[PDB]
PDB file of all heavy atoms in Angstrom:
ATOM      1  N   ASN N 129      -2.889  17.615   9.725  1.00  0.00           N
ATOM      2  CA  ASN N 129      -1.584  18.000   9.250  1.00  0.00           C
ATOM      3  C   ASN N 129      -0.452  17.385  10.072  1.00  0.00           C
ATOM      4  O   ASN N 129       0.439  16.765   9.509  1.00  0.00           O
ATOM      5  CB  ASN N 129      -1.435  19.527   9.173  1.00  0.00           C
ATOM      6  CG  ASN N 129      -2.460  20.208   8.244  1.00  0.00           C
ATOM      7  OD1 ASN N 129      -3.371  19.580   7.668  1.00  0.00           O
ATOM      8  ND2 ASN N 129      -2.314  21.527   8.110  1.00  0.00           N
ATOM      9  N   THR N 130      -0.493  17.520  11.403  1.00  0.00           N
ATOM     10  CA  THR N 130       0.645  17.184  12.253  1.00  0.00           C
ATOM     11  C   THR N 130       0.910  15.708  12.428  1.00  0.00           C
ATOM     12  O   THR N 130       2.041  15.258  12.298  1.00  0.00           O
ATOM     13  CB  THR N 130       0.484  17.803  13.704  1.00  0.00           C
ATOM     14  OG1 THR N 130       0.593  19.223  13.625  1.00  0.00           O
ATOM     15  CG2 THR N 130       1.579  17.289  14.641  1.00  0.00           C
ATOM     16  N   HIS N 131      -0.126  14.940  12.724  1.00  0.00           N
ATOM     17  CA  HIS N 131       0.080  13.550  13.052  1.00  0.00           C
ATOM     18  C   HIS N 131      -0.125  12.613  11.851  1.00  0.00           C
ATOM     19  O   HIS N 131       0.411  11.522  11.839  1.00  0.00           O
ATOM     20  CB  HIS N 131      -0.848  13.145  14.182  1.00  0.00           C
ATOM     21  CG  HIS N 131      -0.756  14.055  15.372  1.00  0.00           C
ATOM     22  ND1 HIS N 131       0.342  14.075  16.203  1.00  0.00           N
ATOM     23  CD2 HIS N 131      -1.586  15.023  15.820  1.00  0.00           C
ATOM     24  CE1 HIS N 131       0.165  14.986  17.145  1.00  0.00           C
ATOM     25  NE2 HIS N 131      -1.001  15.572  16.942  1.00  0.00           N
ATOM     26  N   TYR N 132      -0.922  13.030  10.886  1.00  0.00           N
ATOM     27  CA  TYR N 132      -1.349  12.117   9.823  1.00  0.00           C
ATOM     28  C   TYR N 132      -0.890  12.546   8.442  1.00  0.00           C
ATOM     29  O   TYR N 132      -1.180  11.871   7.450  1.00  0.00           O
ATOM     30  CB  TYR N 132      -2.863  11.975   9.878  1.00  0.00           C
ATOM     31  CG  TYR N 132      -3.317  11.453  11.217  1.00  0.00           C
ATOM     32  CD1 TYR N 132      -3.991  12.264  12.128  1.00  0.00           C
ATOM     33  CD2 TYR N 132      -3.047  10.148  11.581  1.00  0.00           C
ATOM     34  CE1 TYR N 132      -4.389  11.766  13.371  1.00  0.00           C
ATOM     35  CE2 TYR N 132      -3.429   9.651  12.794  1.00  0.00           C
ATOM     36  CZ  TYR N 132      -4.106  10.467  13.696  1.00  0.00           C
ATOM     37  OH  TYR N 132      -4.474   9.917  14.896  1.00  0.00           O
ATOM     38  N   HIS N 133      -0.183  13.671   8.386  1.00  0.00           N
ATOM     39  CA  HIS N 133       0.283  14.251   7.127  1.00  0.00           C
ATOM     40  C   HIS N 133      -0.868  14.342   6.125  1.00  0.00           C
ATOM     41  O   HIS N 133      -0.753  13.939   4.975  1.00  0.00           O
ATOM     42  CB  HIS N 133       1.439  13.428   6.577  1.00  0.00           C
ATOM     43  CG  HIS N 133       2.677  13.506   7.413  1.00  0.00           C
ATOM     44  ND1 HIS N 133       3.904  13.085   6.959  1.00  0.00           N
ATOM     45  CD2 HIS N 133       2.871  13.935   8.683  1.00  0.00           C
ATOM     46  CE1 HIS N 133       4.810  13.273   7.902  1.00  0.00           C
ATOM     47  NE2 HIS N 133       4.207  13.788   8.961  1.00  0.00           N
ATOM     48  N   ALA N 134      -1.985  14.877   6.597  1.00  0.00           N
ATOM     49  CA  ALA N 134      -3.199  14.977   5.828  1.00  0.00           C
ATOM     50  C   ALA N 134      -3.696  16.406   5.870  1.00  0.00           C
ATOM     51  O   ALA N 134      -3.374  17.160   6.812  1.00  0.00           O
ATOM     52  CB  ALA N 134      -4.242  14.030   6.399  1.00  0.00           C
ATOM     53  N   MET N 135      -4.478  16.782   4.867  1.00  0.00           N
ATOM     54  CA  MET N 135      -5.031  18.130   4.804  1.00  0.00           C
ATOM     55  C   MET N 135      -6.487  18.106   4.397  1.00  0.00           C
ATOM     56  O   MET N 135      -7.044  17.048   4.120  1.00  0.00           O
ATOM     57  CB  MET N 135      -4.227  19.010   3.859  1.00  0.00           C
ATOM     58  CG  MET N 135      -2.821  19.302   4.345  1.00  0.00           C
ATOM     59  SD  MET N 135      -2.030  20.685   3.498  1.00  0.00           S
ATOM     60  CE  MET N 135      -1.515  21.673   4.892  1.00  0.00           C
ATOM     61  N   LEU N 136      -7.120  19.273   4.417  1.00  0.00           N
ATOM     62  CA  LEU N 136      -8.510  19.386   4.016  1.00  0.00           C
ATOM     63  C   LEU N 136      -8.642  20.626   3.151  1.00  0.00           C
ATOM     64  O   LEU N 136      -7.966  21.624   3.383  1.00  0.00           O
ATOM     65  CB  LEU N 136      -9.471  19.459   5.209  1.00  0.00           C
ATOM     66  CG  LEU N 136      -9.518  18.258   6.163  1.00  0.00           C
ATOM     67  CD1 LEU N 136      -8.499  18.438   7.284  1.00  0.00           C
ATOM     68  CD2 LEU N 136     -10.925  17.998   6.734  1.00  0.00           C
ATOM     69  N   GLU N 137      -9.473  20.552   2.119  1.00  0.00           N
ATOM     70  CA  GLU N 137      -9.750  21.744   1.337  1.00  0.00           C
ATOM     71  C   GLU N 137     -11.188  21.760   0.823  1.00  0.00           C
ATOM     72  O   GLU N 137     -11.848  20.732   0.746  1.00  0.00           O
ATOM     73  CB  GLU N 137      -8.713  21.920   0.216  1.00  0.00           C
ATOM     74  CG  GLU N 137      -8.841  20.978  -0.950  1.00  0.00           C
ATOM     75  CD  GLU N 137      -7.810  21.269  -2.025  1.00  0.00           C
ATOM     76  OE1 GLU N 137      -6.596  21.011  -1.794  1.00  0.00           O
ATOM     77  OE2 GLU N 137      -8.219  21.756  -3.104  1.00  0.00           O
ATOM     78  N   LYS N 138     -11.678  22.952   0.520  1.00  0.00           N
ATOM     79  CA  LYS N 138     -13.055  23.135   0.102  1.00  0.00           C
ATOM     80  C   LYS N 138     -13.182  23.083  -1.427  1.00  0.00           C
ATOM     81  O   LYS N 138     -12.305  23.543  -2.150  1.00  0.00           O
ATOM     82  CB  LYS N 138     -13.587  24.464   0.640  1.00  0.00           C
ATOM     83  CG  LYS N 138     -13.298  24.668   2.147  1.00  0.00           C
ATOM     84  CD  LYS N 138     -13.967  23.597   3.008  1.00  0.00           C
ATOM     85  CE  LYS N 138     -15.475  23.692   2.967  1.00  0.00           C
ATOM     86  NZ  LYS N 138     -15.947  24.991   3.509  1.00  0.00           N
ATOM     87  N   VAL N 139     -14.283  22.498  -1.874  1.00  0.00           N
ATOM     88  CA  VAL N 139     -14.645  22.421  -3.276  1.00  0.00           C
ATOM     89  C   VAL N 139     -16.156  22.548  -3.335  1.00  0.00           C
ATOM     90  O   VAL N 139     -16.831  22.546  -2.290  1.00  0.00           O
ATOM     91  CB  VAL N 139     -14.260  21.056  -3.881  1.00  0.00           C
ATOM     92  CG1 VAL N 139     -12.774  20.849  -3.835  1.00  0.00           C
ATOM     93  CG2 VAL N 139     -14.975  19.934  -3.161  1.00  0.00           C
ATOM     94  N   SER N 140     -16.709  22.644  -4.538  1.00  0.00           N
ATOM     95  CA  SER N 140     -18.157  22.645  -4.688  1.00  0.00           C
ATOM     96  C   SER N 140     -18.660  21.428  -5.435  1.00  0.00           C
ATOM     97  O   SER N 140     -18.496  21.315  -6.643  1.00  0.00           O
ATOM     98  CB  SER N 140     -18.632  23.899  -5.406  1.00  0.00           C
ATOM     99  OG  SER N 140     -20.040  23.872  -5.528  1.00  0.00           O
ATOM    100  N   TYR N 141     -19.302  20.518  -4.720  1.00  0.00           N
ATOM    101  CA  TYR N 141     -19.844  19.344  -5.373  1.00  0.00           C
ATOM    102  C   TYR N 141     -21.050  19.657  -6.256  1.00  0.00           C
ATOM    103  O   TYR N 141     -21.586  18.762  -6.905  1.00  0.00           O
ATOM    104  CB  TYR N 141     -20.144  18.241  -4.363  1.00  0.00           C
ATOM    105  CG  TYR N 141     -18.874  17.600  -3.856  1.00  0.00           C
ATOM    106  CD1 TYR N 141     -18.331  17.962  -2.625  1.00  0.00           C
ATOM    107  CD2 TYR N 141     -18.205  16.653  -4.613  1.00  0.00           C
ATOM    108  CE1 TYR N 141     -17.164  17.383  -2.154  1.00  0.00           C
ATOM    109  CE2 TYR N 141     -17.034  16.071  -4.160  1.00  0.00           C
ATOM    110  CZ  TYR N 141     -16.513  16.437  -2.930  1.00  0.00           C
ATOM    111  OH  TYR N 141     -15.346  15.877  -2.477  1.00  0.00           O
ATOM    112  N   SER N 142     -21.461  20.924  -6.291  1.00  0.00           N
ATOM    113  CA  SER N 142     -22.476  21.381  -7.242  1.00  0.00           C
ATOM    114  C   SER N 142     -21.891  21.322  -8.653  1.00  0.00           C
ATOM    115  O   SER N 142     -22.609  21.305  -9.648  1.00  0.00           O
ATOM    116  CB  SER N 142     -22.875  22.821  -6.936  1.00  0.00           C
ATOM    117  OG  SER N 142     -21.797  23.698  -7.251  1.00  0.00           O
TER     118      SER N 142
END
Side-chain angles (χ1 to χ4, degrees):
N129 301 4
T130 292
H131 307 289
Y132 301 109
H133 293 194
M135 293 196 128
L136 298 90
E137 74 178 70
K138 311 298 294 298
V139 297
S140 180
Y141 287 100
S142 70

